[PDB]
Amino acid sequence: ADSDINIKTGTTDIGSNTTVKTGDLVTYDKENGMHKKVFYSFIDDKNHNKKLLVIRTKGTIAGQYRVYSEEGANKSGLAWPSAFKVQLQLPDNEVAQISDYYPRNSIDTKEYMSTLTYGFNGNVTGDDTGKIGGLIGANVSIGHTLKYVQPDFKTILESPTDKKVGWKVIFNNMVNQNWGPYDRDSWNPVYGNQLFMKTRNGSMKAADNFLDPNKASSLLSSGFSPDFATVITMDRKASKQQTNIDVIYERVRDDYQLHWTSTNWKGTNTKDKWTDRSSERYKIDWEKEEMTN
Amino acid sequence: ADSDINIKTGTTDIGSNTTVKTGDLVTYDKENGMHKKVFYSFIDDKNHNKKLLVIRTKGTIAGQYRVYSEEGANKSGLAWPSAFKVQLQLPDNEVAQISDYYPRNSIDTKEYMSTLTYGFNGNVTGDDTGKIGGLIGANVSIGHTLKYVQPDFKTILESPTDKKVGWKVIFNNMVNQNWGPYDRDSWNPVYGNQLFMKTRNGSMKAADNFLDPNKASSLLSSGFSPDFATVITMDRKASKQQTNIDVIYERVRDDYQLHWTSTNWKGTNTKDKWTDRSSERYKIDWEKEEMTN
Amino acid sequence: ADSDINIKTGTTDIGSNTTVKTGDLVTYDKENGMHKKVFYSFIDDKNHNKKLLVIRTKGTIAGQYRVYSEEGANKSGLAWPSAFKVQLQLPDNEVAQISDYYPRNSIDTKEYMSTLTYGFNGNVTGDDTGKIGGLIGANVSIGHTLKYVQPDFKTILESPTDKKVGWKVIFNNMVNQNWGPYDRDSWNPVYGNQLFMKTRNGSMKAADNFLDPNKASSLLSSGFSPDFATVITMDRKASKQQTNIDVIYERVRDDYQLHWTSTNWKGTNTKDKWTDRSSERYKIDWEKEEMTN
Amino acid sequence: ADSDINIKTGTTDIGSNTTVKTGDLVTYDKENGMHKKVFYSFIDDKNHNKKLLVIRTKGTIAGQYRVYSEEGANKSGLAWPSAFKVQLQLPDNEVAQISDYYPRNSIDTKEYMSTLTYGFNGNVTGDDTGKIGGLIGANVSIGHTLKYVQPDFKTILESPTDKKVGWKVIFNNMVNQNWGPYDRDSWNPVYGNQLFMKTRNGSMKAADNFLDPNKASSLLSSGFSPDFATVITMDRKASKQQTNIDVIYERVRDDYQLHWTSTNWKGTNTKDKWTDRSSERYKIDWEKEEMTN
Amino acid sequence: ADSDINIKTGTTDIGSNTTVKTGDLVTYDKENGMHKKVFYSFIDDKNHNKKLLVIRTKGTIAGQYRVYSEEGANKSGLAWPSAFKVQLQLPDNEVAQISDYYPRNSIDTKEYMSTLTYGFNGNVTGDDTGKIGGLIGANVSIGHTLKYVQPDFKTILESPTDKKVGWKVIFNNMVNQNWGPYDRDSWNPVYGNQLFMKTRNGSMKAADNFLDPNKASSLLSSGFSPDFATVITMDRKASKQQTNIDVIYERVRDDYQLHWTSTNWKGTNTKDKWTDRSSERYKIDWEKEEMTN
Amino acid sequence: ADSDINIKTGTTDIGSNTTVKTGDLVTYDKENGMHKKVFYSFIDDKNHNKKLLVIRTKGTIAGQYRVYSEEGANKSGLAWPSAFKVQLQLPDNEVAQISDYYPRNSIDTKEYMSTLTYGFNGNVTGDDTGKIGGLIGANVSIGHTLKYVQPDFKTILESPTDKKVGWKVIFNNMVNQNWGPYDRDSWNPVYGNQLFMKTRNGSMKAADNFLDPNKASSLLSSGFSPDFATVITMDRKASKQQTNIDVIYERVRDDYQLHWTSTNWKGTNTKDKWTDRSSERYKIDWEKEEMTN
């Protein structure tokens, strides 16, 4: 920060002495179950070499964890969100550029601990026959522990360019009633993938043997609220002072299936079975400092 | 935040240089045991493309944990809140939109720890007969631990649209005198669901064998105080500058029953037996910047 | 908070540009051992649709942990506070309303940890007779830990209405010289309830066998200092611009008894034996912005 | 706080727009080893219904941990502070009142953890004779841990009235060279109370067998510095605008004695053997806003 | 900081009373998959002996974790980023100098814990034949634990000069589905280097046996976003008031290979197989306070 | 700090109302691999009895961990930094004085934990002959843990005078691939000092058997960035208003040697084999408030 380099805090930041023009634009996509909000801010700081636009993509993508299929009592399937995505894209002929974005990817860490123990021990024994016994013993224990966080979802910044940026929030792993964690690839020879399996062998119908959504990550059902910021810069001398931008909200759904073998429930997961894609075009007017859709 | 993108903190936020009009509206619903308060704020920032209204829904929904039923000394029932809800809804023809809301769903995490220990040990033994013995030994231990939080209730943001938003605060699980946690589905072959069972086999009447409410989550009895924020935007050019908004406060009650078998207490829980719904209409006047009920 | 919804911090709070009228009112109730202080503040913010009054109830209710009874050397009793309470109440015909209050009830949480260990081990044995032996072994350990806080007292907000609000601070459980925790219902077949029992079997008189109050929660003796806030709103157009309000401070005392069996001390606790209630009426003048008693 | 009730931070606090008159008054009591300092502040905020005086009692009470007694090589005594106290008192005829005070008593908490482990294990054995053996085994472990803080001293607010307030800082327990903790009542049949005992059986004289003060709580020797605030309110219309107040600083000393039995050291503690009481009268002039002694 | 040396916070920092000229410069290098952004700030504080330029290098270097090679079902390779770098360099004849830079290298720490346990134990045994046995035993255990953090990548400041500075973010080690951590040199006699090996033994083709990038450090695929600051100072009297500076963004890729032996998968890692280097020249005009590319 | 003594925060700090003159001076010493930067600030506060100069010494001293020697395949040596130093010195005839400096030496702490466990256990045995056996057993475990931090380097303030001050950052200990920590004196009878030994026994040449610098403290190679502050005071009446000061940056290198015995690698460390000393003279002009070199 500025203070680590002997500069008064805030000296280098953009935007002081600037009337900032902001706006809100809401669209609800019923077919896709996505509340989509752009909150925008134009900053034309004259001591900066460019006009800036900060586009914050917010709203909420419904999770839509849904028992969708029922093919009799022994077979059923559940559609569930394995990824949520938001992307912004300037067309190829645009002079405006993607300059910055937040959040980004951070380095994950883990904590290592070594353990070392030496032991000596001794006994004297005896019985009522008058026999006396003894034992002298020694031991070593060497090992280690490794500790790290495992979020239910990872929030990842996709490799950006000057024309495109995106985030995916992807399913990582999850605990199912204190068992697991399970992921998209968990495989047990008898039970298959147990990710959303309620019981190993209850006599209910397949459709009633999926984890209650209240007992799973709430992103799976009620859903995920993006809160991502993209910065676009624009040269004040550029001929055309209008830019188009497309914003896509997306849900990728996996397909989780239960079937009764003759003796127990068995689960399968199929990756990326459905993709719901909600796309919208915005007009950026840098002269009026308005964004419209 | 602004500072991660090299912008002076607060540069992009709405509302400076604007006289903000605020208000409080209180209703008490005696039949439903709900103190309901709207705290509102109109922000008409002229550098923002829309009028805003922030509606904070507060008050308190009584828990009403209540021994309701007594059918002799061997049978009794307890009504208890498994869910509290607050929902706001704009009618279908309204041009005002739900733009933002807080709190939202956050990603849950868990802490994983791996474990490895190797061991070597030895003995020399002997007795007074002059007999000598020896032992050389080795061992491996491999394993893991998994750690995560389990709140008594989860606070969940329901999938919003541009016309509706809601929160549900739902019972998750609970400790009963250091045993458990139990939930709505706990089942023991002898004791049934033990969630609110005071004793496995005390000789009191059924009505006196429920957990003292002071020894359980205080939301269960005294109750839950919402503190939720909804943002509504309105176009200044819209023809009709009055909006109605309907607000529900809701309590869902489960039914927890004790009966004496000939030898012990046994508990049952039946989900969602009662629903208390308190509904109110508010009038938003965007020109006067008043909200009334 | 405002910044989660893209609004400048503090924009939506009441009270800027307002001369605030405050006051202190102290009463000491000798019979009840209660120092009672109301600190009040009138905020008539013209950009708010209502006059507000924040009433902070403070002071201190003496605990009064007291060895009260002595009926010879084998029997004695101790009066102790199991609950402290503060309530405010507007009479039924008042147009002023209770709008908000603080502190409130929060969701309690707990930390779950699973453990799993697999093990393999091996030995070679031998004695001086030349006999060689061996052992191959395996093991599994599965389990869990559950962690949560247990405060000595809980501070609970009672279900409010628009006319009444109250807090109770209730005894929960307590450690007695590193044993316990004990509560109001602890029962041991030989020792009874050991909550305030100094020794299982010392030869002192009954009156000298109670826990030193310095080794127990200091609320039990020196006592509890409320610090509760109630907000009352008032319509500026209301005909009558005086409101009465009653404030009650209360102590509920349990009765803890020791008796010598022929061989050991045995304790009894009887709940809510005494209630001390100190009640006071205040006059709120919204036009003068004064509160008096 | 104000922000939990939607009010701008600091709106309801007393004292803006007020010239505050402050003062320092120092007295040293040589006989009692007490540096006594009053730091005072008169706040006459005209928008508050009363004049206020905040009296901060500071300075330092020497601990005076002292080997005081020597009656030959086998017997010695140590005087040590088991309590420090500060009290303020308005005489009976005073119209001024005690309104508030800080610090107060807060609720202590403890952390509870349950543990549950199930185990299965097996072996195969054999010797060089070709004889094969086996073992199948199972186990359960159930229990709990309880964790809480134990400060060397507790700071306790004594039950106040509108005329008196006080704090006592009392000895709780203490670790002696990693053994203990011991308190005022620790009793071992052979060693007695070991609180300040250096060695169980060293051959030094009694006077040299007390814990070095550097290895004990530094409040015991160098001493305790009060930092307590008392608020007094005064009606501006009161006839008499002078108030007297008495302030007492106190040290209570226990008496810790060592004697040689014929074989080991044995300790005794006698409670409250000495009380050192330093008392001072101050004059509060509310019209001049001066405090003098 | 200033306050540790009795100086008002911020007194010694550069830049108050100075109009700061800032700018953004974005380039996207498609061949190299690097979004490159310079955010710059000229501070010409007249109370400072030099003009300053702070150059912040940001953007994102795609990770580009890529299964690149397929030579039938038994052999496949993966390209993965073992290092990201950003470097800035002033040509040899330039009078401008590198003065400061942030972040830097900090001292790593570790936590040491010693353990010591002594034990005594005893038994009495007996059977229905009247035979009695006894055992007295003792034990000592001595050891230690050592705890420290192991980030997936280290961020290292390369030894700077007055003409050059650089950072490398280098692969350190990584957990693969709870096994490991593995690094560039991990070697198991049967499995080779297991860093990105999905299964020890699965029957899939080689190209499908690499760790899912979602289950590895997200820097490996989506990539790394520099956020580094370089400070350049310039004498106001220097003859030439234009400076060039060359900036490299770099990715170093390792080569991770799987082959089927006749019985299991075996991995190889080859270090630094590919280097992608993207280079850009910037022109610093100290008189106009502009940076261009 | 000021507020602990009832004084408004910042009241007693130097420097308000003072135009502060600052400067940067950079020198790069190629022979010694030291980037050396002085950031200075003259504070002439007229309400302070002296002129002040704060000299911050920054830059970076390259670590220069270097395999330097190769005398065939069995012998090699590594030069490594065991100390970094920065010193400032006023000559003997100077009236200016060293007044303060930061960072300084802090008290190190450690955490002690005692453990005590008592146990009782019992068995009943039986065999198919009908014979019944039994065991009653008891046990005690007593001990302790000690926990403390061990940084790779310590940052130490050298004993200052009014004419000289310095810091040394010294090698403390280090972990080598999870073994150790080792220090400058570690000695194993077979392996010698293993500090930088890559393998106990690999068949590579000596020069390739040193720890990869990426797997060691990054100060060892890339190096250490001082960030030290020295305050010099000057009397305004002093005859001579020019001061010289010498600043030395220093690297002390140890010599770590590997040799093959006939069977394994063996390491030697020789302390302080080389010292690189980079010295510079600065001129302080208190009248012009400039520092030059």
Oligomer: part of a larger assembly
Amount of helix of chain A: under 10%
How big is the Rg of chain A? 29 Å
Could you give the order of the helices and strands of chain A? EEEEEEEEEEEEEEEE
Alpha plus pi helix count of chain A: 0
Q: Give the end-to-end Cα distance of chain A, rounded to a whole number of Å.
A: 37 Å
Look at the helices and sheets of chain A and give the structural class.
mainly beta
Q: What does the largest sheet of chain A look like? A: 7 strands, antiparallel
Largest interface: A-E, 65 and 80 residues
β-strand number of chain A: 16
**Strand residue content of chain A:** over 45%
Number of domains of chain A: 1
In the CATH hierarchy, the architecture of chain A is: Distorted Sandwich
Name of the CATH superfamily of chain A: Leukocidin/porin MspA
For this structure, the CATH topology of chain A is: Leukocidin-like
Query: What general outline of chain A do the C-alpha atoms trace?
Result: flat
Which CATH top level class of chain A fits? Mainly Beta
